[PDB]
Design an enzyme around this catalytic site. Structure first.
Site, mmCIF file in Angstrom:
data_model
loop_
_atom_site.group_PDB
_atom_site.id
_atom_site.type_symbol
_atom_site.label_atom_id
_atom_site.label_comp_id
_atom_site.label_asym_id
_atom_site.label_seq_id
_atom_site.Cartn_x
_atom_site.Cartn_y
_atom_site.Cartn_z
ATOM 1 N N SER A 157 -0.904 -0.115 1.802
ATOM 2 C CA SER A 157 0.354 0.352 2.369
ATOM 3 C C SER A 157 0.115 1.332 3.515
ATOM 4 C CB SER A 157 1.206 1.022 1.315
ATOM 5 O OG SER A 157 1.580 0.136 0.267
ATOM 6 N N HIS A 179 7.618 4.166 2.578
ATOM 7 C CA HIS A 179 7.511 4.136 1.126
ATOM 8 C C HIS A 179 6.329 4.983 0.647
ATOM 9 C CE1 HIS A 179 4.746 0.489 1.463
ATOM 10 N NE2 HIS A 179 4.195 1.094 0.430
ATOM 11 N N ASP A 211 10.629 0.333 7.176
ATOM 12 C CA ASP A 211 9.585 0.964 6.384
ATOM 13 C C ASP A 211 8.547 1.575 7.324
ATOM 14 O OD1 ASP A 211 8.027 1.858 4.270
ATOM 15 O OD2 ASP A 211 7.454 -0.165 3.568
HETATM 16 C C1 LIG Z 1 2.548 5.409 -2.177
HETATM 17 O O1 LIG Z 1 3.415 4.686 -3.082
HETATM 18 C C2 LIG Z 1 3.016 3.453 -3.412
HETATM 19 O O2 LIG Z 1 2.002 2.924 -3.008
HETATM 20 N N1 LIG Z 1 3.889 2.881 -4.249
HETATM 21 C C3 LIG Z 1 3.629 1.546 -4.729
HETATM 22 C C4 LIG Z 1 3.877 0.511 -3.666
HETATM 23 C C5 LIG Z 1 2.951 -0.334 -3.101
HETATM 24 C C6 LIG Z 1 1.493 -0.387 -3.376
HETATM 25 O O3 LIG Z 1 0.976 -0.427 -4.480
HETATM 26 O O4 LIG Z 1 0.801 -0.304 -2.278
HETATM 27 N N2 LIG Z 1 3.572 -1.118 -2.127
HETATM 28 C C7 LIG Z 1 2.973 -2.195 -1.343
HETATM 29 C C8 LIG Z 1 2.889 -3.508 -2.094
HETATM 30 C C9 LIG Z 1 3.422 -3.619 -3.360
HETATM 31 C C10 LIG Z 1 3.355 -4.805 -4.077
HETATM 32 C C11 LIG Z 1 2.750 -5.904 -3.549
HETATM 33 C C12 LIG Z 1 2.170 -5.858 -2.258
HETATM 34 C C13 LIG Z 1 1.546 -6.986 -1.675
HETATM 35 C C14 LIG Z 1 1.003 -6.916 -0.424
HETATM 36 C C15 LIG Z 1 1.064 -5.740 0.307
HETATM 37 C C16 LIG Z 1 1.665 -4.628 -0.213
HETATM 38 C C17 LIG Z 1 2.245 -4.645 -1.509
HETATM 39 C C18 LIG Z 1 4.930 -0.795 -2.118
HETATM 40 C C19 LIG Z 1 5.972 -1.302 -1.349
HETATM 41 C C20 LIG Z 1 7.246 -0.779 -1.512
HETATM 42 C C21 LIG Z 1 7.432 0.233 -2.429
HETATM 43 F F1 LIG Z 1 8.684 0.750 -2.579
HETATM 44 C C22 LIG Z 1 6.422 0.755 -3.206
HETATM 45 C C23 LIG Z 1 5.140 0.231 -3.048
#
Ligand SMILES: COC(=O)NCc1c(C(=O)O)n(Cc2cccc3ccccc23)c2ccc(F)cc12
Ligand SMILES: [Zn+2]
Length: 226
Positions: free
Chosen positions: A182, A45, A89
């Site tokens: 992430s 992602h 992922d």
């Molecule tokens: C580089 O592109 C991004 O970062 N895009 C945003 C994005 C994020 C983030 O903001 O990191 N996370 C982790 C995440 C989103 C929410 C709660 C969370 C709670 C705990 C851990 C991770 C979490 C994703 C997962 C799947 C996805 F399609 C997109 C995202």
């Protein structure tokens, strides 16, 4: 990282800071880790139009000699990655050149064994992500110790799969990986076992991590062929 500590600077020399560029929005950021001198492992992602990797960082606002800013030539997103379920992922980034080995920059290769990790033990995750729901990404590398949970603890994530993913973080604690973390590694006794994938917007643990053991064949295939 919520409820963690500031990492000792350069104590995790495999850590990678990713700037992810897209055509229709500003930069986003992820973590990752160096598994070969020219390969970084991260989350699918975190894919974009282009990516830059910074190795050797602690405070990502303060340039220093340990920094290596490195070009990515190609992104290898898992071919079965699903944007609805978030299954698979995982992604490999090939660097244009091999990184320099220094005190502050080194690889974290996998051990020969790829044993299934059961719930129960404590592991550690690091990143530059948000330190709260309403707080911004950390300038400094942070880390936290988290508990591997039985899979029923992640049942409320309806697309969670025990074979594909780890369930990470005691729900009774605030401690958690969060937004901005992430792609970063979960280490159990010094061995990378998970990748930060997703969780709840309100930061209530547990969160969901990619189970690296499941993807060891795929990782091997990419590394051998490129
Ligand atoms: C580089 O592109 C991004 O970062 N895009 C945003 C994005 C994020 C983030 O903001 O990191 N996370 C982790 C995440 C989103 C929410 C709660 C969370 C709670 C705990 C851990 C991770 C979490 C994703 C997962 C799947 C996805 F399609 C997109 C995202
Ligand atoms: Zn330094």
């Amino acid at each position: 990282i919520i409820g963690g500590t500031e990492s000792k600077p350069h104590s995790r020399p495999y850590m990678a800071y990713l700037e992810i560029v897209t055509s229709n929005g500003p930069s986003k950021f992820c973590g990752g880790f160096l598994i070969r001198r020219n390969f970084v492992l991260t989350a699918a992602h975190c894919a974009g139009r282009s990516i830059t990797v910074t190795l050797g960082a602690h405070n990502i606002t303060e340039e220093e000699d340990t920094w290596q800013k490195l070009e990515v030539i190609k992104q290898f997103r898992h071919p079965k990655y699903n944007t609805s379920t978030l299954h698979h992922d995982i992604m490999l980034l090939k660097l244009k050149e091999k990184a320099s080995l220094t005190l502050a920059v080194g690889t974290l290769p996998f051990p020969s064994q790829k044993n299934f990790v059961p719930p129960g033990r404590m592991c550690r995750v690091a990143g530059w992500g948000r330190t709260g729901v309403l707080k911004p990404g950390s300038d400094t590398l942070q880390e936290v110790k988290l508990r591997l949970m039985d899979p029923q603890a992640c049942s409320h994530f309806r697309d969670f799969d025990h074979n594909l993913q780890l369930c990470v973080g005691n729900p009774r604690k605030t401690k958690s990986a969060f937004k901005g973390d992430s792609g970063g590694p979960l280490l159990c006794a010094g061995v990378a076992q998970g990748i930060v994938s997703y969780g709840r917007s309100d930061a209530k643990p547990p969160a969901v991590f990619t189970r690296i053991s499941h993807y060891r064949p795929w990782i091997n295939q990419i590394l051998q062929a490129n």
